[PDB]
From Swiss-Prot, chains A, B:
It comes from Pyrococcus furiosus (strain ATCC 43587 / DSM 3638 / JCM 8422 / Vc1). This is S-adenosylmethionine synthase. It comes from the Archaea. Keywords: ATP-binding, Magnesium, Nucleotide-binding, One-carbon metabolism, Transferase. Signal peptide: none annotated. GO terms for biological process: one-carbon metabolic process; S-adenosylmethionine biosynthetic process. It catalyses: L-methionine + ATP + H2O = S-adenosyl-L-methionine + phosphate + diphosphate. Catalyzes the formation of S-adenosylmethionine from methionine and ATP. ATP binds at residues 135-140. The keyword Nucleotide-binding applies. Its cofactor is Mg(2+). It is an enzyme of class 2 (transferase).
Amino acid sequence: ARNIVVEEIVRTPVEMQQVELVERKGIGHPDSIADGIAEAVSRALCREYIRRYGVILHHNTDQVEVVGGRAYPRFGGGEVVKPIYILLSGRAVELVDQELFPVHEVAIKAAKNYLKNAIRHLDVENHVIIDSRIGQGSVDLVSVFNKARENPIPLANDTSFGVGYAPLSETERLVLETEKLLNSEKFKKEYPAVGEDIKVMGLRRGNEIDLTIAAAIVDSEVATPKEYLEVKDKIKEAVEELAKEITSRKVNIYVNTADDPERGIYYITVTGTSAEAGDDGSVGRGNRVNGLITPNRHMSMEAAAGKNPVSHVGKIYNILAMLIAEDIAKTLPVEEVYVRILSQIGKPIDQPLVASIQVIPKPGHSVKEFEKDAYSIADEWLANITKVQKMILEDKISVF
Amino acid sequence: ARNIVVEEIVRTPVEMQQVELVERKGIGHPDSIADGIAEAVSRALCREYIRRYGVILHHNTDQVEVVGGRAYPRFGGGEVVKPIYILLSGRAVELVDQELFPVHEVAIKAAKNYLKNAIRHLDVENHVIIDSRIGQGSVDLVSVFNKARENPIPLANDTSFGVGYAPLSETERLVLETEKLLNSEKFKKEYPAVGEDIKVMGLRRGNEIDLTIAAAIVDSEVATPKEYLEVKDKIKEAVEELAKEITSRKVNIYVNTADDPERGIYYITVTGTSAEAGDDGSVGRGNRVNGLITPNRHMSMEAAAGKNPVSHVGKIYNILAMLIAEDIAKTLPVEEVYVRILSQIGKPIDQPLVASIQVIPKPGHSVKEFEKDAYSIADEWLANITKVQKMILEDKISVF
Ligand SMILES: Nc1ncnc2c1ncn2[C@@H]1O[C@H](COP(=O)(O)OP(=O)(O)CP(=O)(O)O)[C@@H](O)[C@H]1O
Ligand SMILES: C[S@@+](CC[C@H](N)C(=O)[O-])C[C@H]1O[C@@H](n2cnc3c(N)ncnc32)[C@H](O)[C@@H]1O
Ligand SMILES: [Mg+2]
Ligand SMILES: [Mg+2]
Ligand SMILES: [Mg+2]
Ligand SMILES: [Mg+2]
Ligand SMILES: [Mg+2]
Ligand SMILES: [Mg+2]
């Protein structure tokens, strides 16, 4: 009864296309900082709503503005001159039965806690000003969310679509795992100088990949330009070892391409994030739920970070489409699968207006052989969409 | 001498796929407000930079946060209780040879002027607080003039990427023209109750299109819920006529699906924008430069609104790719044309690393019959990239 449509599409697989471009904005990137703050605020509000009332109340904190500060990085240790200003926005329930909910206290505390754990060399108390302007949702949009027990499956709060796909190409996996490696605790233990503001661009032309990495180096961990260049080489070497595990194509690796040692220009920072130096961020300006920006693929413009995991489809459908695509790619003979799920505002989220599954079958296979299998996969995920909510609160899935 | 490559691509045309999704956020939509303000601020800064110094100085105002307020909409005329808060962010040159440039005065005045001309029932002076945190750039004019002399066409410092396509499918044209119609001046005088916060979602399933419209209705123009339902029907009728002008497919029109008259839930607003109440906005969260959100196509994540129209290569490339595609589709026999432009480091931006032109020819035609014509089109646009910049500053091209 669910509007699931499985169709064959003709197209050159991404792996066979001549030009493939993939980008990822690391954790310390201002846009990703905004995403992370939005998500941390949302999850904190969920937990606190449950802790106080045993139920999640309406709130979408998918609105964070990172206003870059000013800093003077110096080898051996720089200084921030003007702190980073972060405006928390969005919607949250502040009035609960005439009692006041600590919206701003929870949001600001969650934002700060995320920055403390995400950016290691960022002094949150002195390098960051966090203000909260989170408002209260509209009397009507709040009503569809409030239909809890009335609708065991929550109703969709908007008419929006989520887009996912699978499997990842070699270039996509390379870009994704490059950022994850350079921002993993293990790699940080090995090279503390590598900040979190890491931007990875993978550009494949034929069977040759150019992997450009922009990695902010913490100036307190490098005393001289030579130490900085050595940190760059270790980044390169680590990514070389990783690339050999991911693809047999030739991989050219470039680290901080804007550097000009002859002019003393170096990508060093005080805190490890370019947000310190006049670079701005906001929600929905970077990675999709799969952690990548893939113009060779298809994407939804719906941001996932900060949206409640109960009713907002921009987050739920982007996650579900990705998971449906992954399961199809993992179990059925498909070269590629793209999933698009469209909500109708005021319809249960398990009854999308359409769940489009476009498949490129592997050579020798026809879609009629497994179309019902793909149908069942999407139907089961849509029938268990509520599980995605738990996956968010239990920190089992990332949204950027 | 330009690396323009015209290739044939074999793939299911969008018009031929079973499921197509298209979305457009009208001018009054909070995200579109942020985009519109971002671009309006940028254009105001450009004009004022030129008026004072005869040259545009660096600036990026692609950071605007529309914080929803609070309102009590009532049939016959409601009231705003908490004004909308808009934060202008980004960076701009405020010190020009140590003399002060009115960055914030220009920006806030431009944001207000854009709102006054965009949302007709919005009292900007009492319903909106606009504050600016745009950062300070310092420039010595001798340097900007010297980097002209040296390079008339700016050189690319990074690998930037633009994507365009043409022609628009019937569903894309239907979504686009629906928003344009309902937000046209003629329709506004005929139905003043229809606000500017108009979001159109088009779903094509085979040869049946479901067209969902979310239109904020001005509560001062509808005296009773019945008049509100009547306005909805008038929208439906106008779009029915428009649909018959575009396609011979079955078109189902749905307007404000969240309404629940039995519980008094209505999409009425005081100002004609949901920014007054339960929706927030930020830049780069909605339409692409072609005015649409198209998951069946290849979109860029890059926000174009607010980015400098002379120096930001990603914005001009996305616009140029769109224009190249449109010119190709309107002049040559192609079912579809996808245009991708990649810049080459330290080369002029009119000398891209590659200008990929992928074309699906119409039946009976082959690409080699018209490949040189498509080459010339893209070559001419790349040679007139500066004129395109002028078109942007002269408000002759839209970016959302
Ligand atoms: N010296 C430097 N070298 C390389 N990268 C740097 C850098 N300083 C900052 N960066 C990184 O580049 C980003 C700003 O560069 P830029 O504005 O040209 O990219 P962009 O136009 O694509 C906006 P976005 O970063 O959101 O994609 C910073 O946020 C940071 O991640
Ligand atoms: C549904 S709101 C997003 C949800 C909201 N931000 C929240 O916190 O739940 C997004 C867009 O939908 C439209 N919209 C707002 N209220 C609506 C309603 N009651 N019915 C239909 N569409 C609505 C507006 O154009 C708005 O920009
Ligand atoms: Mg950005
Ligand atoms: Mg939002
Ligand atoms: Mg949305
Ligand atoms: Mg939005
Ligand atoms: Mg750049
Ligand atoms: Mg970028």
